[PDB]
């Protein structure tokens, strides 16, 4: 997840006379040099946006250097990676590190640590690209480092799911929060439509959970079209459409929600059922509809980002075949 | 006094200290005593009696006068 975070810092101004000739430009350049490309305060900082507040260029009191410091408050574009987050492109660097190490080549620099105890790895040699699912271990943003540090497993579609029992209604402020979230998903869906469709079909079939879902049947461009395939059980609902009509304040959400593995993960579809008709291996969780919509919406966000980056990085069929030892492995573990 | 006293002397080298030393800590600021509000310095011993001898009216020789050459030599 990329985002914007407001930071606070104190600079050191070696030449206050030359610095003040253009305060804002020099301040922005100093901030960009210092903080871009390095994680700082539990965020990665991809790009420095203009400053919000700053102090007058003071003079260093406790030394005869004559330099100034000046305090700066600024906002920056930060990439924060979470648990269960989906990363679609990871390069293996070394096999001598038997614990297995990788380096993500997406827009968010992360160095991944895929444990070798699981047998689904140690099959990927050095130089090939394979996606990773981030485990529940928290991404470590050690300050000053050029990239995030995290541990995660090679993605298997994980045919498990969670049912959600709602007991609180949405308010208009929460409605606006999830409407910003669906704005994000609309951007992602437009990006998906902009790609060469057959690659999304292939990657979606590969990471679909239950069965191979027969054949090419039921085109799945998804964008502005609630089309889908498989159709295992129960009538689904469009979480997006539920959102906009909830923004119109019609529908209540006081029900049981789930996205079982039979659904297409990148689709905005889900099931709203009144009395828990799902075959859950877990107890329903009793909490508010803001939690449910946040969780499902960001699940869709990371699944669709996953497929988008997989389609983007695999622009040609030769690269897929170069990493052939992963595709048949995942097809084995369906 | 000069009976064997030793006093420390350090020369500032930093620009901030050098600017400070001449502007703030110069001895001209300690001419007037902070303690007593009066002057600290003046003539002592050789000059306190020297000022009296110079400015007294009559010497044992006569009137306390000097010719031009010795008046010039005082300066
Ligand atoms: Mg003495």
């Amino acid at each position: 997840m990329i985002d914007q975070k407001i930071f606070e810092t104190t600079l050191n101004i070696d030449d206050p006379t030359n610095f003040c000739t253009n305060v804002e430009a020099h301040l922005l350049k100093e901030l960009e040099n210092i903080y871009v490309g390095k994680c700082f305060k539990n965020s990665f900082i991809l790009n420095i946006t203009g400053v919000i507040q700053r102090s007058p260029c003071f003079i260093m009191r406790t030394n005869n250097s004559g330099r100034g410091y000046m305090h700066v408050r600024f906002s920056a574009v930060v990439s924060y990676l979470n648990a269960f987050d989906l990363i679609a492109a990871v390069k293996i660097i070394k096999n001598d590190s038997n614990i297995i190490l990788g380096e993500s080549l997406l827009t968010e620099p992360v160095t991944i640590v895929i444990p070798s105890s699981e047998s689904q790895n140690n099959v990927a040699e050095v130089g090939q690209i394979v996606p990773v699912q981030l485990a529940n271990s928290s991404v470590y943003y050690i300050p000053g480092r050029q990239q995030a540090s995290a541990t995660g497993s090679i993605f298997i579609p994980k045919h498990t799911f969670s049912v959600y029992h709602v007991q609180e209604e949405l308010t208009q402020e929460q409605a606006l929060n999830l409407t910003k979230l669906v704005n994000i998903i609309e951007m992602l869906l437009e990006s998906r439509s902009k790609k060469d469709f057959k690659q999304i079909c292939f990657f979606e079939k590969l990471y679909y959970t239950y069965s191979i879902s027969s054949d090419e049947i039921l085109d799945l461009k998804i964008w502005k079209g609630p089309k889908g395939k498989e159709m295992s059980r129960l009538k689904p609902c469009n979480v997006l459409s539920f959102l906009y009509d909830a923004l119109k304040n019609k529908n209540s959400s006081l029900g049981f929600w789930a996205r079982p593995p039979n659904l297409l993960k990148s689709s905005p579809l889900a099931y709203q059922q009144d009395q828990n008709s799902f075959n859950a291996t877990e107890l329903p969780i009793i909490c508010s509809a803001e939690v449910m919509f946040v969780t499902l919406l960001k699940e869709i966000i990371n699944y669709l980002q996953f497929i988008n980056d997989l389609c983007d990085t695999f622009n040609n069929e030769q690269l897929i075949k170069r990493h052939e030892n992963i595709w048949m492995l995942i097809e084995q573990r369906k | 006094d000069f009976d064997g006293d030793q006093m420390n002397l350090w020369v500032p080298w930093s620009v901030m200290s050098r600017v400070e030393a001449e502007l703030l800590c110069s001895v001209r600021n300690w001419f007037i005593s902070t303690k007593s509000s009066g002057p600290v310095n003046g003539q002592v011993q050789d000059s306190t009696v020297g000022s009296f001898l110079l400015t007294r009216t009559n010497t044992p020789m006569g009137k306390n006068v000097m010719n031009k050459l010795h008046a010039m030599g005082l300066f």
Side-chain angles (χ1 to χ4, degrees):
Chain A
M1 191 88 263
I2 89 172
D3 214 327
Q4 205 193 231
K5 166 181 261 212
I6 296 170
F7 292 91
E8 279 180 11
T9 201
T10 300
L11 297 197
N12 289 329
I13 299 170
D14 295 349
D15 193 352
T17 15
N18 184 30
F19 190 96
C20 279
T21 60
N22 195 342
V23 170
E24 293 306 315
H26 293 165
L27 201 62
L28 266 167
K29 304 301 177 337
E30 281 295 325
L31 285 177
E32 182 245 298
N33 302 357
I34 287 166
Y35 289 118
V36 183
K38 296 159 190 168
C39 34
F40 167 68
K41 296 213 297 179
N42 218 59
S43 283
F44 185 69
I45 313 181
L46 300 161
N47 160 236
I48 291 292
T49 290
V51 314
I52 309 182
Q53 270 162 328
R54 42 162 296 255
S55 71
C57 177
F58 298 109
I59 298 311
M60 274 185 218
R61 212 180 56 89
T62 54
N63 53 73
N64 294 330
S65 64
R67 329 206 303 280
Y69 43 107
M70 152 141 70
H71 311 302
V72 204
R73 165 137 47 181
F74 62 95
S75 72
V77 173
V78 297
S79 57
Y80 187 64
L81 277 93
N82 316 283
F84 306 99
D85 256 34
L86 277 202
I87 203 151
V90 182
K91 191 97 158 174
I92 305 301
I93 340 170
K94 49 196 146 307
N95 265 114
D96 196 29
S97 78
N98 287 95
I99 208 162
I100 287 192
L101 226 37
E103 182 190 337
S104 172
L105 61 178
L106 294 190
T107 40
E108 329 85 60
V110 184
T111 285
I112 196 43
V113 193
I114 318 156
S116 68
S117 66
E118 42 182 279
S119 301
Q120 321 94 41
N121 32 77
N122 308 269
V123 313
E125 71 167 19
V126 295
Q128 65 183 88
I129 296 164
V130 47
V132 170
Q133 219 269 1
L134 296 189
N136 192 11
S137 192
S138 185
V139 176
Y140 278 99
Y141 277 99
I142 42 179
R145 256 33 191 150
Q146 221 83 2
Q147 73 245 243
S149 183
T151 180
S153 176
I154 300 292
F155 196 5
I156 264 48
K158 207 182 57 63
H159 49 277
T160 66
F161 78 110
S162 31
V163 314
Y164 284 157
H165 173 53
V166 189
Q167 293 203 353
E168 257 81 18
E169 204 153 22
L170 296 162
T171 204
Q172 277 148 55
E173 292 197 311
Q174 313 164 285
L176 264 53
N177 302 2
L178 296 322
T179 201
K180 167 31 38 184
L181 248 190
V182 47
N183 295 347
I184 293 162
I185 192 59
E186 306 154 342
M187 305 234 72
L188 294 198
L189 284 159
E190 152 55 0
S191 81
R192 193 183 147 147
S193 86
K194 201 97 153 131
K195 316 303 182 178
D196 48 314
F197 182 49
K198 91 280 209 182
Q199 194 67 292
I200 312 83
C201 327
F202 160 67
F203 275 129
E204 213 98 68
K205 185 264 305 188
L206 184 60
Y207 290 101
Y208 193 79
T209 61
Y210 250 88
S211 71
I212 192 133
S213 320
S214 75
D215 231 304
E216 102 291 8
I217 56 131
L218 284 321
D219 162 25
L220 280 145
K221 46 90 138 181
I222 295 174
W223 170 228
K224 241 66 170 87
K227 44 188 72 197
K229 80 146 64 161
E230 170 75 67
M231 183 46 275
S232 181
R233 177 62 210 115
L234 193 61
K235 40 211 86 83
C237 72
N238 193 342
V239 186
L240 269 53
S241 186
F242 202 108
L243 272 172
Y244 327 85
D245 88 77
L247 184 63
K248 310 305 187 177
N249 324 130
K250 330 334 307 183
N251 272 120
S252 291
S253 200
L254 285 192
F256 291 76
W257 296 77
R259 290 187 84 245
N262 75 272
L263 289 76
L264 188 269
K265 277 317 151 292
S266 315
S267 289
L269 309 173
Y271 290 106
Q272 148 71 344
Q273 202 286 318
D274 301 337
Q275 278 281 330
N276 192 24
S277 268
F278 318 96
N279 186 32
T281 77
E282 65 152 46
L283 288 317
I285 318 156
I286 322 95
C287 43
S288 80
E290 177 168 38
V291 181
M292 286 50 191
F293 277 169
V294 154
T295 56
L296 318 157
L297 275 162
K298 205 187 253 307
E299 273 145 65
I300 308 155
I301 301 327
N302 65 260
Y303 291 123
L304 201 177
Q305 196 65 59
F306 180 106
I307 57 99
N308 272 356
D309 306 31
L310 257 189
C311 92
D312 281 345
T313 189
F314 282 109
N315 208 144
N316 44 59
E317 295 100 343
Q318 71 95 352
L319 201 66
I320 288 185
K321 298 169 185 180
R322 179 81 209 62
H323 314 334
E324 95 282 21
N325 188 196
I326 305 305
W327 328 124
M328 36 59 87
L329 170 57
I330 172 58
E331 296 209 321
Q332 173 168 9
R333 299 184 179 259
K334 206 68 47 64
Chain B
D1 50 356
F2 313 126
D3 57 351
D5 291 7
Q6 299 195 72
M7 312 187 346
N8 305 103
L9 196 149
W10 75 87
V11 184
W13 49 269
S14 174
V15 189
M16 292 230 197
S17 181
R18 274 164 51 210
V19 163
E20 154 143 340
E22 59 196 79
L23 283 195
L24 192 75
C25 301
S26 281
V27 293
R28 77 176 77 102
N29 307 291
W30 326 129
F31 171 70
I32 301 297
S33 190
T34 306
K35 160 188 156 281
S36 63
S37 310
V40 172
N41 314 83
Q43 310 301 340
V44 290
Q45 293 167 31
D46 261 297
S47 309
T48 293
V49 80
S51 292
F52 158 74
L53 298 177
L54 166 60
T55 53
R56 62 176 169 160
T57 307
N58 285 105
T59 61
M61 297 270 192
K63 203 136 278 279
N64 196 6
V65 289
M66 53 216 150
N67 73 81
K68 176 184 178 169
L69 184 65
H70 291 86
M72 285 193 303
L74 294 202
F75 290 91

